[PDB]
Amino acid sequence: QKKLEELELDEQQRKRLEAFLTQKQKVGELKDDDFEKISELGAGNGGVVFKVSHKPSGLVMARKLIHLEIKPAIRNQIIRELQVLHCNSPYIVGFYGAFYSDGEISICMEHMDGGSLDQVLKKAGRIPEQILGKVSIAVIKGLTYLREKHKIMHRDVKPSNILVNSRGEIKLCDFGVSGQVGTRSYMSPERLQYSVQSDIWSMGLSLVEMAVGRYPIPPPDAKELELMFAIFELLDYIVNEPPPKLPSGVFSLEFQDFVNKCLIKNPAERADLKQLMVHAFIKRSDAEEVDFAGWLCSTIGLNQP
Ligand SMILES: *[C@H]1CC(=O)[C@@H](O)[C@@H](O)C/C=C/c2cc(OC)cc(O)c2C(=O)O[C@@H](C)C1
């Protein structure tokens, strides 16, 4: 009916956060020896990432390995810096722990069974508007948390940083680095010359990317839209040229307006989190009852039961 009732942290969310905490605690010490490899998730980037079983617990996790040599007590420091990922947000990927072994940093995260939205994009081709509404909500809230707690620089909001799962959860994985770009840049115009204003830009660029199915600078221009429905050069383009936009006709005017407000070049004019939270796209999005899990499971060929 017209119930519209959950909470600030819908008790389910609150419960899932508690459950995760408890499980993280009963895992205990994290030794290379306790990990049976299941598969190789999205690899490469800074380092390969593996899906693994942790024999003691019987938990599936995502373990990311970065190669870095030296291990002189100050490592238990480098590890302590990583221990700052030990975040309590529904819009932030869970962290189990981190260790060193065999000249290799391990960072063990919660297994998100839908993977990253860059990988979903490849299976989907395009990600539809109602799904990107829910994505938008999760990202905005995730930034809100980070801004009102971690004061963390984050780094970027890209599809590769947005993980999803068959429970319909959407979490940022972008986690910072102190670690002592081929055609695509998500850098705001202002930072090509910190704060959330840069992240609002990236999210806006990423929504266009996921909506059209293609990194949108330079614009498809040459029809492509009719069909569909270097770094240095690109940077001056982002600074000099006008921001991207969704094509018309295909996307709601609400949706076009929302992304338009994220991709205003001047950050003083560009929308802040508070305005996004009450934009009509978001209001409509929040009221829509979207079967995100079913969309997602079908798209990537995940067996639900
Ligand atoms: C967080 C994400 C990254 O750092 C980036 O490399 C990401 O795109 C690579 C994918 C990681 C991934 C993939 C799946 O697919 C099923 C599942 C999970 O849980 C993860 C993940 O959380 O990896 C963490 C370590 C990196």
Question: Within 13 A of 113's CA, how many CA atoms are on the CB side?
Answer: 15
Under 8 Å between Cβ of 150 and 86: no
Picking from 255, 127, 141, the residue whose alpha carbon sits closest to that of residue 196 is 141
Q: What's the gap between Cα 99 and its chain centre?
A: 23
C-alpha 75/C-alpha 72 separation (Å) is 6
Element of type H or E holding 211: helix 196-212
CA atoms of 201 and 269, how far apart (whole Å) = 12
Kindly give the number of the ligand 1 atom that is closest to the alpha carbon of 173. 1
No. of H helices and E strands in the chain?
Answer: 11, 8
Report the nearest-CA residue for atom 2 of ligand 1.
173
The SS3 call for residue 167 is: coil
**DSSP assignments along 24-46, one per residue:** HHHH----GGGEEEEEEES--TT
Q: Is 104 helix (H, G, I), strand (E, B) or coil?
A: strand
300 membership: H or E segment, kind and range: helix 292-300
Please tell me the distance from the alpha carbon of residue 304 to that of residue 166, in angstroms, as a whole number: 7
Token digits of residue 285: 């999005």
Nearest Cα to 63, choosing from 83, 36, 45? 36
In angstroms, the CA 235 to CA 233 distance is 6
Distance 261 CA to ligand 1 centre (A): 29
Distance 98 CA to ligand 1 centre (A): 15
Do the first three CATH levels of 11-110 and 115-300 match, i.e. the same topology? no
In whole angstroms, give the CA distance from residue 130 to residue 190: 30
Find residue 53's DSSP bridge partners: 36, 60
Return the active site residues: 156
Burial class, 125, CB count within 10 angstroms (exposed 0-12 / middle 13-18 / buried 19+): exposed
Has 244 been labeled as part of a binding site? no
Q: How far apart are CA 159 and CA 178, in angstroms?
A: 22
Q: List the residue whose alpha carbon is closest to atom 14 of ligand 1.
A: 115
Gap from CA of 164 to ligand 1 centroid (Å): 10
Specify the CATH number of the domain 115-300: 1.10.510.10
Structure tokens at 265: 């070049």
Alpha helices in 83-166 (DSSP H): 117-124, 129-147
For the chain, state the CA radius of gyration. 20
Farthest-apart Cα atoms in the chain, separation = 62
Domain locations in the chain as residue ranges: 11-110, 115-300
- Stated length of the chain: 305
DSSP assigned state of 92:
B
Q: 11-110: CATH homologous superfamily?
A: Phosphorylase Kinase; domain 1 (3.30.200.20)
CA atoms within 13 Å, Cβ hemisphere of 107: 26
Strand 170-172 and strand 59-67: the pairing is unpaired
* Positive or negative: CA dihedral 83, 86, 87, 90: positive
Pairing label, strands 104-110, 95-100? antiparallel
Closest C-alpha to 204, from 168, 248, 159, 163: 159
Residues 6+ apart with CB under 8 A from 291: none
C-alpha triplet 209, 211, 214: angle, nearest 5°: 40
Give the CA distances from residue 127 to residues 13, 20, 162, 285, 298, in Å, rounded to whole numbers and listed in that order: 25, 29, 13, 15, 13
Is 174 annotated to bind a ligand? Reply is: yes
* CA separation, residue 125 to residues 20, 119, 288 (Å): 33, 10, 23
Own/partner contacts of 269-272, CB < 8 Å, gap of 24 or more, are 270/197, 270/200, 270/201, 271/200, 272/196, 272/197, 272/200
> C-alpha angle 278/281/287, rounded to 5°?
85
Cβ–Cβ under 8 Å, residues 290 and 133: yes
Of 65, 77, 74, the residue nearest 102 (C-alpha) = 65
CA distance to 20, 21, 96, 109, 295, per residue, from 24 (Å): 6, 5, 6, 10, 29
CA gap 141, 92 in Å, rounded: 10
Give dist(CA 251, CA 216) in Å, integer: 15
